[PDB]
Amino acid sequence: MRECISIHVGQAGVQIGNACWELYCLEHGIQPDGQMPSDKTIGGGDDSFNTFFSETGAGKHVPRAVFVDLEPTVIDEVRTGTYRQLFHPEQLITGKEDAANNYARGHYTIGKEIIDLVLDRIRKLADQCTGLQGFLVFHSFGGGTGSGFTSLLMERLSVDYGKKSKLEFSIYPAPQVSTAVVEPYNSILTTHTTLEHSDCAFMVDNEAIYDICRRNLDIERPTYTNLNRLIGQIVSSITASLRFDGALNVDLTEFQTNLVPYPRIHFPLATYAPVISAEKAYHEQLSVAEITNACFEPANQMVKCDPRHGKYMACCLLYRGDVVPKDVNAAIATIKTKRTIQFVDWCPTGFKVGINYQPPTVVPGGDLAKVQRAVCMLSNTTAIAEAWARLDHKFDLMYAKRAFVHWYVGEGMEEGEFSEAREDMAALEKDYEEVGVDS
Amino acid sequence: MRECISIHVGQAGVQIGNACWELYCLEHGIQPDGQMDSFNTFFSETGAGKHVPRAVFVDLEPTVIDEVRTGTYRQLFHPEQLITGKEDAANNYARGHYTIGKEIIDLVLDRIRKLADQCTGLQGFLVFHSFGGGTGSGFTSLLMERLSVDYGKKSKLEFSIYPAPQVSTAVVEPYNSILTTHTTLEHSDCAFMVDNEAIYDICRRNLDIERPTYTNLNRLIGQIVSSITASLRFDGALNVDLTEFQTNLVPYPRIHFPLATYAPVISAEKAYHEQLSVAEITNACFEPANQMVKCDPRHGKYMACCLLYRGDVVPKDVNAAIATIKTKRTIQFVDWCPTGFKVGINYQPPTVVPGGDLAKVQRAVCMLSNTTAIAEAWARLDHKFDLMYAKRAFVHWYVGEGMEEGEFSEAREDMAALEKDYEEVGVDS
Amino acid sequence: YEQMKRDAEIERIMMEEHDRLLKEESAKQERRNKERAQYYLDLEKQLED
Amino acid sequence: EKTSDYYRISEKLPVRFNNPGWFHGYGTKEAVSMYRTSNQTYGSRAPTVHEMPKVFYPSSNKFSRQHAAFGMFQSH
Amino acid sequence: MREIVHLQAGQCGNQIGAKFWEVISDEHGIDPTGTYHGDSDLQLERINVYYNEATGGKYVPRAVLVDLEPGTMDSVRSGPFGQIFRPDNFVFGQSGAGNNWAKGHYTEGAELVDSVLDVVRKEAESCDCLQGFQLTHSLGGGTGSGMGTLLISKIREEYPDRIMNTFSVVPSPKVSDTVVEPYNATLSVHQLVENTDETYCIDNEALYDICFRTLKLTTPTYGDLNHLVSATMSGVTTCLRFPGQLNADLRKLAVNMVPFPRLHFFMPGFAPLTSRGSQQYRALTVPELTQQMFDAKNMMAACDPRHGRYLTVAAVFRGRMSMKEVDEQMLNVQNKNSSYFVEWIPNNVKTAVCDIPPRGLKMSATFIGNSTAIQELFKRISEQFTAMFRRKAFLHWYTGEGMDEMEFTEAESNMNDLVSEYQQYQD
């Protein structure tokens, strides 16, 4: 009725979807092989799984997701792992030979043989169910099929569906922490579709999650499993107001109009505030007014850009658990009291507030704790303009000596597409300037 | 009371009848030794409690009959129903029509008399053949001509396998498939057409099976035949009769070539996850990659459709499915058929064979259509006829067994007449 | 008073037949559920084969 | 293995979240090998009695479907 | 014979209005199954102002509940008194407004407005004589402010001489909970000044200061703030249902109140609101009830009316009281304070009394003030709209489906005059 479809792309996006579908399965009663485990016991009041599952004829729930990869090895751990008896075997779409850190392979010459499959399998899923609030896709900038096929999926999915909303989730390169030398060449040139053909494109850096774990939690050396568990608690907080009812609930339509001022300023941030080691949750309080002051701390952001340099355009607040509405309104006016927290001259209102009654669930073996309260602070901020200022400089430094170009140009890519991407991001460095000064 | 009599001609007919009579004997309670009121359509009943069917198996190779004798259904048939010739027709229409078939056409028609006088009132024969081989073309043609003149108004159903575009075995297949139609067109009151390549692609694509053998193909054909005649055997809401859908289906007296389609051909793996609604399978049987003869329906106007739903169906859903089929603007329909459709509904689900590769499905559809798409599936046979017969290969065997040279050309102008009938009835008004 | 008493009795009768309709609808729904369970069972049997 | 025994609950939670032993599809705690890839750490352990949700407030839609079937009311 | 219809709009109105029928049915004595089990005898004598008849002597309330998401209708049906509403009377779309006023006015809600009016014409057919409709919505969101306005301008055109009444959750000044609030609120007053006969200003910040400083609650949730509004909607129309001395209906409070036909934005308040520690300590007398009506704390709108003159003032008392203590106590306000009152109306006070108190109190009132301080939240809403619209902050989410930009600077033309009209009548 109020559903969503989760389309996963690439090796980064599949391993998000190994973490999400573990965590939605724990939030309902669903076992890893379907099978709602009630056995001859009566129950009444249900259908909180229509947003991410489909009850079929045998009583077995199958989720709405397509898994897309151009690599065989990543997806075939799902086909032999524990969740093999949950996904429909047509919905684990597998490529044959990978893009290998290449926009031109993932967008011009290898995704052509596979795009006919995925757009048949999506249309099978959506015709099946009534409404559609919107897709929630997952990808990564720094790789071939994560940014090539994703740039071809979004150009084709915005034509034939249109007015149904989209979301977008990204893995964004760091200043320091990089894994490829192809990383600036394809994190500049993937913006020709994540500007025109995305309604909200959330932004997550690997570097701050590498640093938020060492400081809030008593963990050192965190691997990629611990990065996936944290972003699984964001997507299970944006969509939590669809399933479990609340006093003030926001749908996917509701925070879209409260957060993007102009239709080329859709690059918000996100933070999760009550991140705390399970030993440390015994110690502090984590009140209703403690965890909202933590959302604006520069140590606990998500992209390594200083929040004390830009101006906040809009904020959406997604509270979860036992929250009273008087304590929320005591918190917000305290933030506008302090004068080192900067809001734009044409926005005195500032905030959008959502509250759900469902407490944030725990995961077994997870380093996150059990806390009665949680919040996920969405914000659109001028400080992300200074985050492309360390990527345009890593692009023209590359491009002047024409290093690593001959792979792209031999695959159906013309050299007029490189410098066209550089002006289309140097244009956006004025769109985030021209709405900064006062009147 | 509403009975039907089956004649299986040739090896294709014998193997189709194999898969059939396994399916019917497991569908009723009857074990293969004949030992256990709906059998009276197909099974004669003795006083002891043996059930014996109305079937006649005829082939000229002795092997294709005595492996039916050796196999595990030997107890069922009277051992004089199993009829055997001395030499096979050797892929020759003329040789099967003339030099072998005259010896035992008397025996097979006397068995036809003896079986058809052991009933009350006939409804329609079911003969099974193919258009690739000698006896299965020619002896079938003599059999159906003589039986039509001898019975008259008694309806018959011919079942045929067409030679596919790129799937073929012999080389004289255009010759015998154009020489069968000239005198196998106007004596059969209905005839149905399938081909092997379409069944190969449906097995490869819909079912999760690679690389099938003729067993699976015969299982599918038996499913379609059982879907046709379950309205005779098993009662339900809207049961249609043989004369019912013949009058509803054949527009003009030489356009009697309906297609076949059977909608939920899906494995247990896909059936367990997928829902299956009757609107879904109504669209899925009009999908242009699920038909059973390789003619593209997008080139073809549908003169008539008749749907045969079996299982847990209710009439409002079939009616909404019909409306949403005619609503679409990608499926063509004939400019002088406003009604379009015919509906039958049975109350018994499809019965599943052990060892078969289908799934037991709560709602199935057998779709029949008289469409103009099939007209472009004859010009390939006529061009292969041209390519052979212009430089005149392989004619001297057929005319040494006995013919004149003008009879193949008579078949050629018969196919030209059929081409122009299918072209002229499809145009505008 | 006599007409009022007849009205009360007839209204109670119709609410009794509505309660009968409610119980038969719940019975039909549980019948559909047991049909779904049966289909799941023999599909698992075919997978074992 | 029974979460109403271990934790208190709201009595309307379904049996799936009541009985955690039925989630049989997860990984089976293989002892470690050297060739241990890192993306396979996602969803490596089944939920236990501690991680089940205490309360559940899903959005039913049965009444809304069974009323808005067809069209809304209009005076003809 | 004078009956009304209670429309409910949006998701904020469905928290108000679902608590509105648990207060009226407490008053009229109806069980959740819909059958009368009450104490007194005149209690169901005027049951037909709100409710309706069915077979077998069961009473159904009349309403129509709209939404653009189907989640709220299941929540209302599973409420405590959610059994009595008819299931035909719920109407709802399938895709939410998404806090977009333009979606809820043009593209997402206009499919629904042709189906709500078929319910409304079915309920307005059943009347003896309609006193007027009634609506409950919110000026902050999308589906309360867009489609809840599109109901108003189409009901008013086809029922032109009925007394339309609304109840509005005006957005807060700064303690706010939506980024795109001033586009949503300034585009609704443009169509709410010319189509409503009365409209009430309910701050969500004056509804917390009541719940901290005069009630002294600990965790004020939404469950009781719906109740504070739902005691005022019962309090205005007690004169309609129950008898008394100097009754004043829903209409005769309008005639005495609005002096010029664009100044109908009121500010209400409820008189005995006493902390549960000081229930032993309040003294039940008529003058002690009056000092709560004119106290600046029990104003329930966003501006303190000591910054100007009241234009006209109501007081609908309830209970058993001498009507000399009513008409003397209002006089002692107009002489002790004189500069705070408009001096070209020689008597600014309308009073009313009825004999049936609320359940659990001896007496209660309902203050209504048409103060000239209400220009102040009109400036603060307009100043947070002329900062967004300097450089078009969020405009492309509204423009892209068919609203051109000149219907935004037309709004402030129909908004910056209404700031001025209170100022020329200020003195």
Author numbering:
A (entry chain Bm): 1 to 439
B (entry chain B2): 1 to 36, 47 to 439
C (entry chain a): 149 to 197
D (entry chain Fw): 53 to 128
E (entry chain Bn): 1 to 427
Quote from the publication:
Our in situ cryoET studies have provided high-resolution reconstructions of native structures within mouse and human sperm, enabling us to identify Tektin 5, SPACA9 and CCDC105 as novel components in sperm doublets.
We then performed local refinement on the 48 nm-repeating structures of doublets focusing on the microtubules, aiming to reach the highest possible resolution (see the workflow shown in Figure S1). Inside the A-tubule of mouse sperm axonemes, twelve helical bundles form a filamentous core parallel to the longitudinal axis, whereas only eight helical bundles, identified as Tektins 1–4, are present in bovine trachea cilia 13. Among the four mouse sperm-specific helical bundles, only one is a continuous 3-helix bundle that runs along the entire length of the doublets. Indeed, multiple Tektin 5 could be fitted into the continuous 3-helix densities with 16-nm periodicity, with minor adjustments of the orientations of individual α-helices of the original AlphaFold2 model. Furthermore, CCDC105 fits well into the continuous 3-helix densities at the ribbon, with their characteristic proline-rich loops matching the protrusions in our density maps. SPACA9 (Sperm Acrosome-Associated Protein 9) was found to be the best hit (see Data S3 for the top 30 hits). These densities can be explained by three modified Tektin 5 molecules, in which the two intermolecular interfaces near the two NME7s (a previously known MIP shared with bovine trachea cilia) are disrupted. In summary, the various helical conformers of Tektin 5, together with the more uniform 3-helix bundles of Tektin 1–4, are arranged with different polarities and orientations, forming the most extensive MIP network inside microtubules discovered to date.
